[PDB]
Design a protein around this ligand. Structure first.
Ligand SMILES: Nc1nc2c(ncn2[C@@H]2O[C@H](COP(=O)(O)OP(=O)(O)OP(=O)(O)O)[C@@H](O)[C@H]2O)c(=O)[nH]1
Ligand SMILES: [Mg+2]
Length: 179
């Protein structure tokens, strides 16, 4: 019936677009750095009505001081990274895991790779090669999920696949109700 899900990850990794496509099927036209947002409503998940409380947060270190205020009583935490920026994956390991482990010790964390569509975007690929990098590979992400002890690994593209975004929240809900 009710599940609280909080989304965290580095700035610009895709959190807000992920949440807006799910909650309104509306991809955000312009980018605005997030501080906090909450959207609480009844969603039809397959059949069953489930009341989700969705929390958006800041990826910026400058809000580290208040970010944890959103964590109490979370049923699932979606730790997100940007598939087009491998440094955001390192953050899941060096910062996000520790922060969730410290404030939501008993919560299920899902590792969510965002912007999967950028894996085939030439501009992205050229800029990454110029720094001797490639996008995070599927296997790289999955390996990071085992590394941090995440309940699962999943990927999406809020920009190009509404279904991929639906799948994120369906699995996050599953994580919630399985307890
Ligand atoms: N190609 C692509 N770009 C995306 C996708 N999702 C988001 N973006 C873009 O990446 C930028 C950041 O997306 P947001 O969802 O606002 O980032 P955030 O993680 O919410 O950022 P903070 O609020 O600063 O933590 C925006 O310009 C988006 O339009 C995606 O699935 N594909
Ligand atoms: Mg945001």
């Amino acid at each position: 019936v009710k599940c609280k899900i909080v989304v965290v990850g580095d700035s610009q990794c895709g959190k807000t677009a992920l949440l807006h496509v799910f909650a309104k099927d509306c991809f955000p036209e312009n980018y605005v750095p997030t501080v906090f947002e909450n959207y609480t409503a009844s969603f039809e998940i397959d059949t069953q009505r489930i009341e989700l409380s969705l929390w958006d947060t800041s990826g910026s270190p400058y809000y580290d001081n208040v970010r944890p205020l959103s964590y109490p009583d979370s049923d699932a935490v979606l730790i997100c990274f940007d598939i087009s920026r491998p440094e955001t994956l390192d953050s899941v390991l060096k910062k996000w895991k520790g922060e969730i482990q410290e404030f939501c010790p008993n919560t299920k964390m899902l590792l969510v790779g965002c912007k999967s569509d950028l894996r085939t975007d030439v501009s992205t690929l050229v800029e990454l090669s110029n720094h001797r990098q490639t996008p995070v590979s599927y296997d790289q992400g999955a390996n990071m999920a085992k590394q941090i002890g995440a309940a699962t690994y999943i990927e999406c593209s809020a920009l190009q696949s509404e279904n991929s975004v639906r799948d994120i929240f369906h699995v996050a809900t599953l994580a919630c109700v399985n307890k």
